[PDB]
Design an enzyme around this catalytic site. Sequence first.
Site, PDB file in Angstrom:
ATOM      1  N   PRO A 184     -62.716 -45.398  27.891  1.00  0.00           N
ATOM      2  CA  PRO A 184     -64.043 -45.443  27.227  1.00  0.00           C
ATOM      3  C   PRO A 184     -64.411 -46.890  26.918  1.00  0.00           C
ATOM      4  O   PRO A 184     -63.576 -47.702  26.482  1.00  0.00           O
ATOM      5  CB  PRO A 184     -63.801 -44.732  25.883  1.00  0.00           C
ATOM      6  CG  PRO A 184     -62.630 -43.759  26.225  1.00  0.00           C
ATOM      7  CD  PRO A 184     -61.720 -44.662  27.097  1.00  0.00           C
ATOM      8  N   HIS A 228     -67.556 -56.447  32.135  1.00  0.00           N
ATOM      9  CA  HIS A 228     -68.690 -55.908  31.311  1.00  0.00           C
ATOM     10  C   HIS A 228     -69.644 -57.070  31.079  1.00  0.00           C
ATOM     11  O   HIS A 228     -70.838 -56.934  31.256  1.00  0.00           O
ATOM     12  CB  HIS A 228     -68.076 -55.419  30.020  1.00  0.00           C
ATOM     13  CG  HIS A 228     -69.114 -54.837  29.116  1.00  0.00           C
ATOM     14  ND1 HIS A 228     -69.310 -53.469  29.018  1.00  0.00           N
ATOM     15  CD2 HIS A 228     -70.082 -55.460  28.424  1.00  0.00           C
ATOM     16  CE1 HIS A 228     -70.284 -53.287  28.125  1.00  0.00           C
ATOM     17  NE2 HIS A 228     -70.784 -54.479  27.794  1.00  0.00           N
ATOM     18  N   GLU A 229     -69.117 -58.250  30.684  1.00  0.00           N
ATOM     19  CA  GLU A 229     -70.057 -59.384  30.444  1.00  0.00           C
ATOM     20  C   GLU A 229     -70.672 -59.936  31.702  1.00  0.00           C
ATOM     21  O   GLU A 229     -71.894 -60.272  31.708  1.00  0.00           O
ATOM     22  CB  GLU A 229     -69.413 -60.533  29.652  1.00  0.00           C
ATOM     23  CG  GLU A 229     -68.679 -60.063  28.355  1.00  0.00           C
ATOM     24  CD  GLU A 229     -69.442 -59.102  27.449  1.00  0.00           C
ATOM     25  OE1 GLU A 229     -68.749 -58.331  26.803  1.00  0.00           O
ATOM     26  OE2 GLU A 229     -70.665 -59.060  27.470  1.00  0.00           O
TER      27      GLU A 229
HETATM   28 CO   LIG Z   1     -72.502 -54.849  26.662  1.00  0.00          CO
END
Ligand SMILES: [Co+2]
Lengths: 183, 183, 183, 183
Positions: free
Chosen positions: B109, B154-155
């Site tokens: 998650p 994610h970044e």
């Molecule tokens: Co974000």
Amino acid sequence: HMSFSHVCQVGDPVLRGVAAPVERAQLGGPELQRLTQRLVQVMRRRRCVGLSAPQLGVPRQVLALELPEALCRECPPRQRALRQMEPFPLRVFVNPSLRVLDSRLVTFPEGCESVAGFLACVPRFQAVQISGLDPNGEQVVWQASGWAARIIQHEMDHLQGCLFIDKMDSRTFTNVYWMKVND
Amino acid sequence: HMSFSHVCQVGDPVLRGVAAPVERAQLGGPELQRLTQRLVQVMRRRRCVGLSAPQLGVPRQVLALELPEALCRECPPRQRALRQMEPFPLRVFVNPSLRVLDSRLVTFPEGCESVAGFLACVPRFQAVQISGLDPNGEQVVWQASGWAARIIQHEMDHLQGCLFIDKMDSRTFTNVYWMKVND
Amino acid sequence: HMSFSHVCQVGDPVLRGVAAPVERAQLGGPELQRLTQRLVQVMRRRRCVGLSAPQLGVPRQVLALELPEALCRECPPRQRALRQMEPFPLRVFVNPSLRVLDSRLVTFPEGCESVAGFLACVPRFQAVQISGLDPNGEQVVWQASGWAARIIQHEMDHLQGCLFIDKMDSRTFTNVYWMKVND
Amino acid sequence: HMSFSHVCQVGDPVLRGVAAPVERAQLGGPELQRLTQRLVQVMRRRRCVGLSAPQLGVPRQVLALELPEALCRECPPRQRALRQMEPFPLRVFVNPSLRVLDSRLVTFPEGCESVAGFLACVPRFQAVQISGLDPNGEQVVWQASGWAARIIQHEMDHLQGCLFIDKMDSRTFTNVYWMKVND
Ligand SMILES: [Co+2]
Ligand SMILES: [Co+2]
Ligand SMILES: [Co+2]
Ligand SMILES: [Co+2]
């Protein structure tokens, strides 16, 4: 005599399960009548055009659909015509099944009362037939197209444990407080 | 004179654009320093392990990553080990590029400060390297695996206008107030 | 085996009732142990320092409190000192009562898992004593000041059907994605 | 053409400032016209009966109100009568002032597009007069009672930096997915 009802939000596993059929012993009975009354009450309060039992925490195959003239009328005329949005009266379906009648895909933004505050564009078939029982056990069949067919598809998906976020064009997902505007 | 910052939420088009590069002439300058300081301050206030400039409303290729040991230690040691979570010091990257080094996919998650209040499982590569400039302009290549690799991805995705909802297993999307627990 | 738990959100009337006491016959028993285990598991998952049974939908006078050193150190030392935040071990209270020991008010932002995603400043007493029973019916007492006293007062308020939004400085209410930072 | 707009959410300090008046020289001008067009477009897209310029990020004394008949007819007739809810044409007011004509308080649930997804009961005066300029500088005075008077009061409060959470019965604050219903 008032009580509280709540629309279950994503994360609740009841929204991801496959809803069980209503047992024949329940047809025409008081428990099912209470559930159908509750569904329709919440639908009318929230002005949502359809709603299903799993969204009130009940893992059974029951859904309701209703599109009053006033809701259509509040849609700007050009949008109303493009979305083929036209009024239809209340129908409640028990143990329904769906068949696609026109498989052409049409994409518009949709939201869901169980993913409160968001919209995204979702492809839906142009026309479908929903067949099932009314709460008294009589056979009901409805062939629908346009926006009525989209609502039917959205509610039938809820009885299969499917949410619009499983089918959306994710790059169009938005909080409702963000919107596109004309300059 | 304190000032307000906000993390932009999904719907804001700045999160879906492709961030522009920082120009050579801006490297080491006051404007880029203000931006890096603001990203770090927000990231530390919100205890998020990474943040990118588009999420502060600035469509430029800048991101920051830091995982203090306290944040690892707050993860239960079993979950920490499964997620291969290890601390790392702060790094800020300007105009970074990513190379995938181990393309095996690992799923856990993940959340996003710009989709506040939700998580979903997201497959990510096991190991990657990010190469780019520091705010002063020196070239840095940082190779990492496990959770650090997930945060880098994610970044990096934010700088290409991509959010985790575009890559998730949508059947695991949940409000943070619903969770799986051990009986 | 695994199951799902959820933190009830504002609107659920369970959060506004006055929780009933746990009957002497339930002390030490397996149903109360299941409830206390569940509380602690949610509290540890969400990294919330306290949690009460009404928030898991159980209108009984049970709450738990725990502030691990790791979680404590996620707060910057300047802010930690200002808020008088120090670690403390897990305590579970059944049928608690609260005595105020130092009525001086201290005002800082607080949030609540049952109003997910918002903070507001709330004045709290500087020191209190909570007394009650542990799950096995032994009398337990804890004198606490500073941040620990705030968390005690917030969980006790949940047993009386009071949420922080009833006591807050409403001009300071904010989504968590808006924050004041240092220039 | 295509541009995005957003309604600012609580935490943005623009919502707590006191909006500045529109200067004489600006009346009937192109910049004011752009603002008023934007405000009415957003208000109509969201179907909110009123909206203020601070809620679009613009700290100026401009508000708009409109309740078309279709939107009004979406409210069931018994609730519509209880709330004295009647349609009214578009008004845009610049530098308005408010005078209370009937100070009797009426309490119903109210929401706010800048605190998306929540309702709470708020007492409001039964009748008020709003006096201000239309965007052309003409003097317009509207005497309103019942639900229109409520919306005028809510928008005038936006221009003074006041949100409905400052004036609500906080024990009636609810997510919109929780509701009371009739058995
Ligand atoms: Co974000
Ligand atoms: Co739905
Ligand atoms: Co709380
Ligand atoms: Co408002």
